[PDB]
Design a protein around this nucleic acid. Structure first.
Ligand SMILES: [Mg+2]
Ligand SMILES: [Mg+2]
Ligand SMILES: [Mg+2]
Ligand SMILES: [Mg+2]
Ligand SMILES: [Mg+2]
Ligand SMILES: [Mg+2]
Ligand SMILES: [Mg+2]
Ligand SMILES: [Mg+2]
Ligand SMILES: [Mg+2]
Ligand SMILES: [Mg+2]
Ligand SMILES: [Mg+2]
Ligand SMILES: [Mg+2]
Ligand SMILES: [Mg+2]
Ligand SMILES: [Mg+2]
Ligand SMILES: [Mg+2]
Ligand SMILES: [Mg+2]
Ligand SMILES: [Mg+2]
Ligand SMILES: [Mg+2]
Ligand SMILES: [Mg+2]
Ligand SMILES: [Mg+2]
Ligand SMILES: [Mg+2]
Ligand SMILES: [Mg+2]
Ligand SMILES: [Mg+2]
Ligand SMILES: [Mg+2]
Ligand SMILES: [Mg+2]
Ligand SMILES: [Mg+2]
Ligand SMILES: [Mg+2]
Ligand SMILES: [Mg+2]
Ligand SMILES: [Mg+2]
Ligand SMILES: [Mg+2]
Ligand SMILES: [Mg+2]
Ligand SMILES: [Mg+2]
Ligand SMILES: [Mg+2]
Ligand SMILES: [Mg+2]
Ligand SMILES: [Mg+2]
Ligand SMILES: [Mg+2]
Ligand SMILES: [Mg+2]
Ligand SMILES: [Mg+2]
Ligand SMILES: [Mg+2]
Ligand SMILES: [Mg+2]
Ligand SMILES: [Mg+2]
Ligand SMILES: [Mg+2]
Ligand SMILES: [Mg+2]
Ligand SMILES: [Mg+2]
Ligand SMILES: [Mg+2]
Ligand SMILES: [Mg+2]
Ligand SMILES: [Mg+2]
Ligand SMILES: [Mg+2]
Ligand SMILES: [Mg+2]
Ligand SMILES: [Mg+2]
Ligand SMILES: [Mg+2]
Ligand SMILES: [Mg+2]
Ligand SMILES: [Mg+2]
Ligand SMILES: [Mg+2]
Ligand SMILES: [Mg+2]
Ligand SMILES: [Mg+2]
Ligand SMILES: [Mg+2]
Ligand SMILES: [Mg+2]
Ligand SMILES: [Mg+2]
Ligand SMILES: [Mg+2]
Ligand SMILES: [Mg+2]
Ligand SMILES: [Mg+2]
Ligand SMILES: [Mg+2]
Ligand SMILES: [Mg+2]
Ligand SMILES: [Mg+2]
Ligand SMILES: [Mg+2]
Ligand SMILES: [Mg+2]
Ligand SMILES: [Mg+2]
Ligand SMILES: [Mg+2]
Ligand SMILES: [Mg+2]
Ligand SMILES: [Mg+2]
Ligand SMILES: [Mg+2]
Ligand SMILES: [Mg+2]
Ligand SMILES: [Mg+2]
Ligand SMILES: [Mg+2]
Ligand SMILES: [Mg+2]
Ligand SMILES: [Mg+2]
Ligand SMILES: [Mg+2]
Ligand SMILES: [Mg+2]
Ligand SMILES: [Mg+2]
Ligand SMILES: [Mg+2]
Ligand SMILES: [Mg+2]
Ligand SMILES: [Mg+2]
Lengths: 265, 132
RNA sequence: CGACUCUUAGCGGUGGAUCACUCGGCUCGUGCGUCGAUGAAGAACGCAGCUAGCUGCGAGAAUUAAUGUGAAUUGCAGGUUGAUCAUCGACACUUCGAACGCACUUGCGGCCCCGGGUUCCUCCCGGGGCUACGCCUGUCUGAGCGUCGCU
RNA sequence: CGCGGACGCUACGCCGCGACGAGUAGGAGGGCCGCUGCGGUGAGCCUUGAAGCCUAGGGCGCGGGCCCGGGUGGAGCCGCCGCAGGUGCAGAUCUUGGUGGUAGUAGCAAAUAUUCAAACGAGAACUUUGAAGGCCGAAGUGGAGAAGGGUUCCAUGUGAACAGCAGUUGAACAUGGGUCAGUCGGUCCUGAGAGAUGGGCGAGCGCCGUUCCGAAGGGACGGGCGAUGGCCUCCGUUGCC
RNA sequence: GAAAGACUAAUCGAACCAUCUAGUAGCUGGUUCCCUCCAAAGUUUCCCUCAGGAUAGCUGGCGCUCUCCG
RNA sequence: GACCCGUCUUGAAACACGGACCAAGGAGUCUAACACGUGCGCGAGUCGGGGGCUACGAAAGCCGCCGUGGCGCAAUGAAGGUGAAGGCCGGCGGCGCGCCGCCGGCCGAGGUGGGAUCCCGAGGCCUUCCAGUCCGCCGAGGGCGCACCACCGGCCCGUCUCGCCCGCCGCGCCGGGGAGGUGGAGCACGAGCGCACGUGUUAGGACCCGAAAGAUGGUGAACUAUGCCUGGGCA
RNA sequence: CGCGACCUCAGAUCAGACGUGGCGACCCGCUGAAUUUAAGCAUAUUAGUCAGCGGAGGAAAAGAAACUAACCAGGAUUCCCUCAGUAACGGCGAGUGAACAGGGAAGAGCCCAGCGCCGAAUCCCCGCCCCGCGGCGGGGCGCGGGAAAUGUGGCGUACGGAAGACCCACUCCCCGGCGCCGGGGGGCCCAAGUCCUUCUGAUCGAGGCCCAGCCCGUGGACGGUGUGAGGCCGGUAGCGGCCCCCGGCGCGCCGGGCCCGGGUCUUCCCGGAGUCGGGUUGCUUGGGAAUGCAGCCCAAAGCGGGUGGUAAACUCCAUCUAAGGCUAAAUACCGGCACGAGACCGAUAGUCAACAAGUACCGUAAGGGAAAGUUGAAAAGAACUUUGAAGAGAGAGUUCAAGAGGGCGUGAAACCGUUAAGAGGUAAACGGGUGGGGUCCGCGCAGUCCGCCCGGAGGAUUCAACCCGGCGGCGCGGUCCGGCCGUGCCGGCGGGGCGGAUCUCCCGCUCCCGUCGGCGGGGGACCGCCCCCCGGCCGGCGA
């Protein structure tokens, strides 16, 4: 507030009186009568730079970088190494772009959709969520940030036929929509590779929403995909190729250590 | 999760409406579960407690399989007093021991006209959801 | 062999830092947007069986009626035809205060009307009702050779 | 014929050769140094004992600092890749608290003065009674009041607090008690002066002003009418003229 | 104010209380963790300028075109 | 061996100042703008910041006949205003072969000096002595020559000097054209826009503490200063 | 000197009505400074700002043109982006600083006076009765009384209007007392383990329940309970249920009210006055030979008047009607009651204040204004004995714990007390270097291990090789048959979608003497890219 520290009335005692030329409290017969009122170093009194509300809180980022981050977060939810190293339990899942039929939008019982994540062998992740329900450290306990947990697998559908009431209870499971995708729940924390469970009617829509290189997006205005910068990224099948190992000089890998000086006399 | 936006999920606005709650809601907060003997017959799960009921004790130091009787409810400390749960001071007088009512199972009730109106409604609007 | 003085450790004192908690505050946001001459805001004095304080109320004074709930309140004594806790729509609301009979000592009165010592006849006590300034439409009563003319 | 050949290379890595190194104000870079908090993650640790303190215990780092064992303690905490900040103290006659030296010292010296015996008592250089010896010496260290204070006045108990030593004593504490009017005073009149209405100014809350630019008499008086009733005799009580 | 610049709630060669207010200062004091590398000036012109700032100088940082003729 | 630490100072152990002692708290922060470095996307274009449409979520996603608008692509003059090569060739006009001028065929966006890389490639790189393919190499000299720097020319606007021809619904104080020096923040085959971080200068309380004063609006004559009313006292 | 009447004007404790003071976050009207900046300072700036004064509301003000622009022209006010830190002002120094157009939120418009016509066609109050009446109203009656010709009502207002003709058209409109059909506040109500062995002072913790993975899961947010809980209680979820109350709006009638409109032609009428404007003085604004406002004197006009950003005359065009009025939404909100959340602070912080805080306490006053959180799960808050006049002790006793004792969690340093050790004449303290003495660790006190051969003794369920069964890898097979793909392609009788500043018979309108012709709503073909089934080349199959 603007009133911190200034709802007193003070004036220094001047020189003499063996004091420090500080604003002091105008008289009275109590304890707080000549104690030190204004300034920052006093008991009571204001802080340094009373923080104002018009600090620039928000930021904006361009459009075509928001869409480049979505294409660069979808392209790494397909490798079984950037998902295992993120931390999930994906040792047994039979196919990484996991596409399931359109009759999951007709589920309405979470009892009917655990038998689904058991058949899909994804329950050991939810088991890791039950094995990681713990508290929080610090002053978050008195600000309604009590219990934390660990982010689980995502689920992407096409249309809402009843699935939300049948998944929103299992902790970890984060729902989406293709038409209204999000990054903050695809890249948790700033890191890449959250496990995802696609549906058929959506995974057959990304070709229309984002478009190939020789065909633009038809539900956007004007947008093609970005261009790579180099193709054969694997320089282990480049360098030991017959076109390059021939046109080099000899490799000089002999160590040539310093010699001691002996006296020639 | 809760979706109603006029109900507070805070900690302090739930501790305050508990330590400064009036007596006619202290009535509802101080209830206790019924035994599986009564749960079989009435098809009920919990009732508020009255001065002249019958009680076993499940948890605490004095737990066992004994049937005591309620002496007097003390709804200022959210606590009651039972017949034979007492202990000795220095000189020898017996002082009762406070037990919170959630640790307490009921085996017999104190039935009235104002109690069977309730108990037949907490199974009428119990079965409507069964009719789902 | 001591005493004093300095040094470090163990124990004990003075002191209330640190750690951990929180019925409090700060900022933003939503919906509403309501006082008083039918006596407001504010202040003063009173009220509990044992009571000082804040808090709750107004000679019906830590609350009455009604409805809703349906067995306690509590530091100690007491004594289901509805206790106690809530809501509040029917009753009541002491003295100052824009303050209103004239004053600020709570002091001096007046006009009606009932009860009593009495026997409207004056005074005598008690009880109730009225007696502020400013202005509006009306009713009543009046002034004016400056009006203005008739009778 | 035989089925045999070390280490390495987190490429922001590893290895080798040369010359050099001072440094205030000031500039830059690296910080696996550190504090409080948020997104992520460690199938982390924790009442078979977490934070925090203590330590003649054992060690590492150039250093900032961290880690371990041994004691107390009793319920929540840390590491890594990233984000944000009210983020690191010896001083400012710094601010708020708290304790020493000086110190058992300065000091308890204005107005002439105290002794003896007894009683209650755990206890008496001061308390009460008596016995002397002295002072104020009628413009008093005496008897009563106004201004001010507000329960100090009175009694019975208390002794941990206060009465700058003590205390059986107290203007201290705790329980209770107390202030009686036709004649004493307030009330009632005016004084120097304050202050409304009519009226004047003034953007305005309001201001000058007090007989001055005002239709300022609400009352008695004597007589006549209409009224009423009081034992309507004698009259009251009202209205008008 | 029978006058001295006296007194006006311990305050007078213009009282006290709150607000604009955290008033201005070329002027005094203080300015909070480690290591590594480089390293100075107190001279110039102009200023109601001489306790001060502008300017050139000295210094550090980031790079660049070539060499591996000047 | 060795004076006590902080601080202004040409010069501190100083007979210069602040400092008795311990714990906690304590001083370059926050917006707007601009300049330059640096990281990212799109690219002669870029940007939806304001507006709309569909618990975390007050978030995210879209809209192109919602791209209006901002900066940029084009400068100069006080302004009215103007607004960025030309070479060669045909028959050709007068005159004095040349200019200028009405018409046709081709051509064409400069020049010299340095210039990293590039190309041609005289000559040879053995293993019993002579032919000969490829692969690069080596390589004297010789060629195209990026980026840039210096210089010469040319073009555009403003302004002065010398002087000639052409145009026309309006025939004039009309309009247009050339050569030569001078002024310009300009062209000469683009380089910007939006976001995030860093230092630096500034405007705001602006590294924190510090004055002597200045103004508006209000409270006091219970002490003391003087006039008044009413009473009281001086062997 | 009379009775009389309109006018001007008083009094009343006359009847019935009204306003006055407070809050002051946002608002409208006036009044209005100085610190400060310019390196001084006086015009400027600080500022139409604080303070001061008067008025309201749930929102206030503004407002249907005496308007902008010179275009092929827009068309009430407010509000956001933009123009713009720009045209301009200014010791032309420091510095201040607008609007129009364009895209958007919201969208709503109107009435009187005058001019004239209808026989005051007009209100308010008193009286009686009936209905309803916790917002005092309607209909019937009043030889019952009052105001208005110094003008009450109807039509009617600048988009033109009225009137009288002649033609064309008319069948709903508004409330008020009700009956009746299906947004809001309060109340009470709604899932599932205290299952096994065990740790503990007490479990919510550790483990277990498979071949339905303990149970419900449209409910795993949170809170209470003797540490930590989806399943112990309360609670959350759900177009879940029930019980009350007040409305919004729909339909039946029963009542009263109001008889109204077009088009086409003839004749009439038509607007606000000490104000506009002019001179002047003073404040002001970006407004500059003077934008607005205010004061003094002068003071108008009807083919008129003001404006048309440089003063002045003569001219032409354009656009508007001053001096009188009303009006919802879009916008603002540190106060107020009622609510949710938070990359915030966590008792010297955060509001001054977590607690008997604007309280104690100082000053005559105006005014100034603090310090102060925490036993334990439960007071089970220490019976009794004993010394002492008592305070305070000594044993005992409660709890897991007095090493938690009524200002009681944790218990830091300065500082003091006592114990143990080691010392002591140049104030103590430090640095470099050893030496001695102590505390401690070595869980030291007969000190390596791993490979490989020779030798010594032992024992297995024991090797090499073949035989079947299963998996996996390379395949240059100099080239096994199949596959999909191509930021690879050629031709096609293909079967199709997006675009286009490439081209031109139909629908329509306007124009033309059913015909032309500009303008378009449409076809249809021509291209380019993309998709799609059949056909061919090369190709990888190490994203
Ligand atoms: Mg504070
Ligand atoms: Mg912590
Ligand atoms: Mg709900
Ligand atoms: Mg009492
Ligand atoms: Mg009742
Ligand atoms: Mg008096
Ligand atoms: Mg060095
Ligand atoms: Mg030590
Ligand atoms: Mg605890
Ligand atoms: Mg310190
Ligand atoms: Mg002495
Ligand atoms: Mg004497
Ligand atoms: Mg006396
Ligand atoms: Mg006396
Ligand atoms: Mg006494
Ligand atoms: Mg008297
Ligand atoms: Mg006066
Ligand atoms: Mg005198
Ligand atoms: Mg003098
Ligand atoms: Mg002065
Ligand atoms: Mg400051
Ligand atoms: Mg100051
Ligand atoms: Mg350098
Ligand atoms: Mg000069
Ligand atoms: Mg100076
Ligand atoms: Mg300087
Ligand atoms: Mg020496
Ligand atoms: Mg100094
Ligand atoms: Mg100096
Ligand atoms: Mg000197
Ligand atoms: Mg120096
Ligand atoms: Mg020094
Ligand atoms: Mg000095
Ligand atoms: Mg000193
Ligand atoms: Mg600190
Ligand atoms: Mg840049
Ligand atoms: Mg600069
Ligand atoms: Mg600064
Ligand atoms: Mg001055
Ligand atoms: Mg006096
Ligand atoms: Mg005098
Ligand atoms: Mg009256
Ligand atoms: Mg002024
Ligand atoms: Mg100045
Ligand atoms: Mg200055
Ligand atoms: Mg000055
Ligand atoms: Mg201004
Ligand atoms: Mg001014
Ligand atoms: Mg002003
Ligand atoms: Mg103001
Ligand atoms: Mg008012
Ligand atoms: Mg109101
Ligand atoms: Mg309005
Ligand atoms: Mg209006
Ligand atoms: Mg108009
Ligand atoms: Mg306009
Ligand atoms: Mg601009
Ligand atoms: Mg100048
Ligand atoms: Mg506009
Ligand atoms: Mg709209
Ligand atoms: Mg009308
Ligand atoms: Mg009219
Ligand atoms: Mg339940
Ligand atoms: Mg719990
Ligand atoms: Mg605990
Ligand atoms: Mg729980
Ligand atoms: Mg469980
Ligand atoms: Mg001005
Ligand atoms: Mg005016
Ligand atoms: Mg002009
Ligand atoms: Mg003209
Ligand atoms: Mg008007
Ligand atoms: Mg929310
Ligand atoms: Mg913080
Ligand atoms: Mg504190
Ligand atoms: Mg505090
Ligand atoms: Mg603390
Ligand atoms: Mg405390
Ligand atoms: Mg505590
Ligand atoms: Mg313990
Ligand atoms: Mg303690
Ligand atoms: Mg000791
Ligand atoms: Mg010793």
């Amino acid at each position: 507030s603007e009133l911190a520290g200034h709802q007193t009335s003070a004036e220094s005692w001047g020189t003499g009186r063996a004091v420090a030329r500080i604003p002091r409290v105008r008289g009275g017969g109590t304890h707080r009568s000549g104690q030190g009122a204004f300034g920052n170093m006093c008991r009571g009194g204001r802080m340094f730079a009373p923080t104002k509300t018009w600090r620039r809180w928000h930021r904006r980022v361009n459009t075509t970088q928001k869409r480049y981050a979505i294409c660069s977060a979808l392209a790494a939810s397909a490798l079984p190494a950037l998902v295992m190293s993120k931390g999930h339990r994906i040792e047994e899942v039979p196919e990484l772009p996991l596409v399931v039929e359109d009759k999951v939008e007709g589920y309405k019982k979470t009892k009917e959709a655990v038998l689904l994540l058991k058949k899909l062998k994804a329950w050991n992740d939810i088991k890791k969520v039950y094995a990681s329900q713990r508290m929080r450290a610090g002053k978050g306990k008195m600000r309604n940030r009590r219990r934390i947990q660990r982010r689980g697998p995502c689920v992407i559908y096409n249309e809402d036929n009843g699935i939300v009431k049948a998944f929103r209870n299992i902790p970890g499971i984060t729902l989406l929509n293709v038409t209204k995708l999000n990054i903050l729940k695809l890249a948790p924390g700033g890191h890449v590779g959250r496990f995802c469970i696609w549906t058929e009617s959506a995974f057959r829509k990304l070709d229309d929403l984002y478009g190939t290189w020789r065909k633009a997006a038809s539900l956007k205005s004007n947008y093609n995909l970005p261009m790579h910068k180099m193709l054969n990224t694997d320089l282990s099948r480049i360098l030991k190729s017959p076109e390059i190992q021939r046109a080099l000089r000899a490799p000089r890998k002999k160590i040539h250590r310093r010699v001691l000086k002996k006296n020639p006399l | 999760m809760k979706f109603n936006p006029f109900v507070t999920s805070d900690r302090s606005k739930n501790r305050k409406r508990h330590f400064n709650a009036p007596s006619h809601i202290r009535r509802k907060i101080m209830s206790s579960p019924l035994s599986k003997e009564l749960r079989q017959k009435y098809n009920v799960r919990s009732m508020p407690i009255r001065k002249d009921d019958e009680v076993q004790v499940v948890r605490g130091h004095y737990k066992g399989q004994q049937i005591g009787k309620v002496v007097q409810v003390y709804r200022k400390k959210y606590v009651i007093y039972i017949e034979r749960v007492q202990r000795e001071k220095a000189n020898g007088t017996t002082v009762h021991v406070g037990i919170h009512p959630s640790k307490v199972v009921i085996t017999r009730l104190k039935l009235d006209k104002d109690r069977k109106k309730i108990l037949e409604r907490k199974a009428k609007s119990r079965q409507v959801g069964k009719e789902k």
